[PDB]
């Protein structure tokens, strides 16, 4: 282990940022060594800054220009200046705990300049302050509302649901109360959105919402504005299956079975119209080895900022560089860059560690160290999970010093490919025995057997229906494992292919319900 001395020479990064947090678990991180510390993190949120706070509490930040206006109360915000008022007013929270009388006093005092500040302070004089902003079309108000309580539930009229997709919150806002099932008045008011007035993800999660209530004309039309709009050719492609599903248009079916993007919808269209398994690349480098460590975390930091700033002739410099068998998995990710996305990398290195279990078993594990981390043995998350397979900590600890009881065993063996591939299958084992589907899985794999287990338990979630299972894996309530089950079926099937034990993937949509 390094001492913190040590770790300061370092880059600022998430290696860093690891080794940091592994001091401060340990508690060798004195107050005085806390001192400069958050110069020296990458990313100063969640269990670090948690970690960190407990040594040196942060007061901070007011803006030194408005410290005066903090000074006040809800009893005292008629003391102050005018400048004072306003800024407290920002807080919906702090304009609920005023008295109606202040309310009123205050809406006169701003309801030529600050209208916005009028109609929520006269909102919270009634016993719905959603309705009363509802009855005004204030949209920037309806979302501070949304903001402040998730509970406000009213019918929404065609002009006022046509206005909310021009405010930069509707996104989240139809996202979460589609994909969480809550907000019945808000959801079937949005039925009438006109798709001209959405795009991307937003009219996507519209056509969700407009399946959930079987209106299938108002689905297709979100999905083609999605299918129009939508950057990403995945995106798209999800789109396009929906319009093939719902109208059965055959040169939709024939544009997805076409696609540039390996993903679920283009491999099942190409499954649907006998069309050719895609085309898989071939790495098979004939160097063996460079200098590189693949072995140090603080190195593939350095490496992953560079191939991430490379312009198009730096990229060709660092692919031959890497072009050798030790180095196989940054290859296969400087390549996929290189190509600007547009072929298919399959690596499958340290292949001796799996090559003994089923084709089947190394297929899903295969699928899913290709998602977590592109098979970089030195891997490691915003939360810390580590190395090829991804390993929180905890769970890492628990099969390693628990159940093995492998000796000396530290977190940091996930770093090794051997003990990723064998934690891996004893994970993917306790998993698939209770579960079944490699789509499952990946699902708890991500997200946790809880959480798998509570969505399978609904009466609306995997069952029988028009156009399940493909609307369930729409509203897998955790947006991350939604699409992460998705991404590792895709690599599933493609790996099965390669391993010469191909499956069909309307065999496994079958077995989904
Ligand atoms: C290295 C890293 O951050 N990996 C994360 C991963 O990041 C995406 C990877 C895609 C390939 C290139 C490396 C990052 O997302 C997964 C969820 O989809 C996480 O479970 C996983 O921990």
Same mark, same amino acid.
């Given at each position: 282990q ?15 940022d690891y ?8 508690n ?23 970690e ?5 509490p942060?007061?901070?930040y ?13 009893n ?6 005018? $400048?004072?008022?306003?800024?407290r ?36 004089? $009634? ?22 309580s ?42 009438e ?34 299918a ?20 059965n ?13 390996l993903?679920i ?5 190409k499954?649907?119209t ?6 898989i690349?071939?790495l ?16 593939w ?10 312009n198009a ?32 990398y399959?690596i499958?290195?340290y292949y001796?560690?799996?090559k ?33 397979m ?6 890492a600890n ?37 579960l079944?589907?490699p ?27 028009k ?8 509203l ?31 065999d ?6």
């Open positions: 390094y001492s913190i001395e040590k770790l300061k020479k370092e880059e600022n990064s998430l290696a860093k080794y940091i947090y592994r001091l401060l678990e340990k060798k991180i004195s107050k005085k060594d806390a001192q400069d510390l958050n110069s020296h993190i990458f990313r100063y949120i969640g269990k670090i800054k948690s960190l706070e407990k040594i040196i942060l007061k901070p007011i803006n030194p220009k408005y410290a005066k206006c903090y000074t006040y109360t809800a005292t915000i008629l003391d102050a200046n005018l $400048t004072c008022q306003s800024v007013l920002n807080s919906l929270v702090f304009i609920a705990s005023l008295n109606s009388k202040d309310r009123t006093t205050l809406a006169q005092t701003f309801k030529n300049q600050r209208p916005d500040l009028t109609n929520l302070l006269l909102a919270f004089n $009634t016993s719905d302050p959603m309705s009363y902003i509802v009855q005004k079309e204030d949209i920037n108000g309806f979302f501070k509302l949304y903001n402040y998730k509970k406000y539930d009213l019918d929404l009229n065609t002009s006022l649901v046509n206005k909310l997709p021009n405010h930069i919150g509707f996104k989240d806002f139809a996202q979460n109360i589609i994909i969480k099932k809550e907000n019945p008045k808000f959801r079937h008011s949005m039925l959105i006109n798709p001209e007035n959405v795009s991307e993800d937003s009219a996507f999660y519209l056509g969700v919402n407009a399946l959930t209530y079987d209106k299938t004309e108002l689905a297709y039309d979100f999905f083609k504005k999605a129009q709009s939508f950057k990403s050719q995945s995106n798209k492609d999800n789109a396009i299956f929906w319009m093939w599903l719902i109208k248009n055959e040169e939709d079916l024939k544009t997805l079975s076409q696609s540039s993007s993903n919808y283009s491999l099942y269209a499954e649907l006998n069309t050719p398994f895609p085309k690349e071939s098979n480098p004939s160097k063996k080895k460079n200098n590189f460590n693949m072995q140090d975390p603080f190195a930091q350095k490496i992953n900022k560079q191939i991430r700033d490379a002739s730096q990229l060709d410099v660092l692919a031959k560089e890497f072009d050798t068998q030790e180095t196989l998995p940054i290859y296969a990710y400087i390549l996929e860059r290189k190509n600007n996305f547009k072929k298919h399959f499958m290195p001796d560690n799996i003994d279990y089923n084709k089947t078993r190394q297929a899903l594990i295969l699928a899913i160290a290709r998602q977590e981390s592109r098979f970089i043995p030195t891997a490691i998350s915003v939360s810390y999970a580590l190395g090829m991804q390993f929180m900590p905890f769970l628990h099969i390693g010093e628990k159940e093995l009881k492998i000796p000396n065993f530290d977190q940091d063996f996930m770093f090794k490919p051997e003990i990723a591939y064998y934690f891996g299958n004893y994970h993917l084992n306790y998993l698939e025995s209770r079944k589907s789509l499952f899985v990946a699902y708890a794999y991500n997200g946790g057997i809880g959480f798998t287990n509570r969505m399978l338990a609904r009466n609306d979630m995997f069952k029988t229906g156009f399940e299972p493909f609307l369930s894996m729409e897998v309530p955790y947006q991350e494992s939604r699409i992460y089950g998705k991404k590792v079926l895709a690599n599933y099937i493609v790996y099965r292919h390669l391993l010469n034990d191909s499956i069909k993937i309307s496994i949509f079958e077995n989904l319900i």
